[PDB]
């Protein structure tokens, strides 16, 4: 609020926290990103390197639906099965009765392999997958099939 | 100095423990007797100002 600002504490003091010599003006260094190559060059070289220049090729008409690929790691793969069935599926690891995980149903496009699923056979439906994610799923006894 | 301190510590295990490992600075001199046989103190005076040119 206004009563906890320093403007109320600066009542009486002449420059209101801005200095006698400096004489707080409208825009003494410019406006906005003014002089990022001339007189704020040191700021734009120290704190924001990479500001000036055309890197990369232009991608005309970008839609993020094409780049829709949220990633689910293997340690977060077992979050998908709900807790009412999670303990019944972790215990009694059965090849015949394996939990299927519709990873796309929650909205993860690609399964990655950050590691250490328990040694259970688990059915994984994927749009994409990595090599190490499949090898750890193969090591646990599960299978990955692809959906679209 | 490390080799001397290790050797002095090795000998201090046998005899002369607390063998003064640390360096001491130039301590002020203890009291001494200055005899005067053959050393009668010759008196000195300031020299007069001589131009020496």
């Amino acid at each position: 609020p206004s009563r906890f600002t320093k403007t109320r504490k600066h009542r009486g003091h002449v420059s209101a926290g801005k200095g006698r010599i400096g004489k707080h003006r409208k825009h003494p260094g410019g406006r906005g990103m003014a002089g990022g190559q001339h007189h704020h060059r040191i700021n734009m070289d120290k704190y924001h390197p990479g500001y000036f220049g055309k890197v990369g090729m232009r991608y005309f008409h970008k839609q993020q639906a094409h780049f829709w690929k949220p990633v689910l790691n293997l340690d977060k793969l077992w979050t998908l099965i709900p807790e009412d069935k999670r303990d019944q599926y972790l215990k009694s690891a059965s090849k015949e009765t394996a939990p299927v995980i519709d990873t796309l149903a929650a909205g993860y496009g690609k399964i990655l392999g950050k590691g250490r699923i328990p040694n259970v056979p688990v059915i994984v439906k994927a749009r994409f997958v990595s090599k190490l994610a499949e090898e750890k799923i193969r090591a646990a006894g599960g299978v990955v099939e692809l959906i679209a | 100095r490390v080799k001397a301190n290790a050797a002095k510590r090795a000998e201090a295990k046998a005899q002369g423990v607390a063998v003064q490992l640390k360096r001491q600075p130039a301590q002020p001199r203890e009291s001494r007797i200055v005899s005067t046989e053959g050393n009668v103190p010759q008196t000195l005076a300031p020299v007069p100002y001589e131009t020496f040119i």
Partner: protein
Amino acid sequence: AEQVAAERAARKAANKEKRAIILERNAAYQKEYETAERNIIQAKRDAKAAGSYYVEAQHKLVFVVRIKGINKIPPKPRKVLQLLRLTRINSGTFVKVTKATLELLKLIEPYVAYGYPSYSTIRQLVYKRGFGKINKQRVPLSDNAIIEANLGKYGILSIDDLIHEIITVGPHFKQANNFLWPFKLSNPSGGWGVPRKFKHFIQGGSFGNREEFINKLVKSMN
């Protein structure tokens, strides 16, 4: 059956034996003061009888008093004054004479008046103005209990144990002198004896070595 006499008589017995061992310590330290003084007198007289000259031993201890204020001090003198804990005017401390400490006194010489303190000067100083640095505080000494609490590991059981370790500079001088706070001395009572302080004592001023007249200066400041 109430635990009154069961701890008061034991504490009074402990205080009586602590006072008895301090009494014989002060008796032992007293008797070595006259022997170390009278043999020095007798060594001078024996050398005079033998036709020689007795060089007395150089003084192991200086008492150094800051006489000039905290303004307009160059940084190399200012660091040494802080290292000797002379932070204000008429702040005194004891400095063990070595070659390292001698060139320190040569470097802050226009700001301090140092000399060789006598036993009477030291014991009057620590009785009147001796304060102990215990947990970064100036607790005044005022009994041998806090001397034993903070200097009992070095064998200093009393203020006279502390006095003897100062005048006869022993192996626990660094611990004992750092325990003593810098002496907040007053201005001298009869003045400084000079019209102008900031010349050398040889040049009729106040700073520098006044070798045995630091007793006349500090007995007036105390």
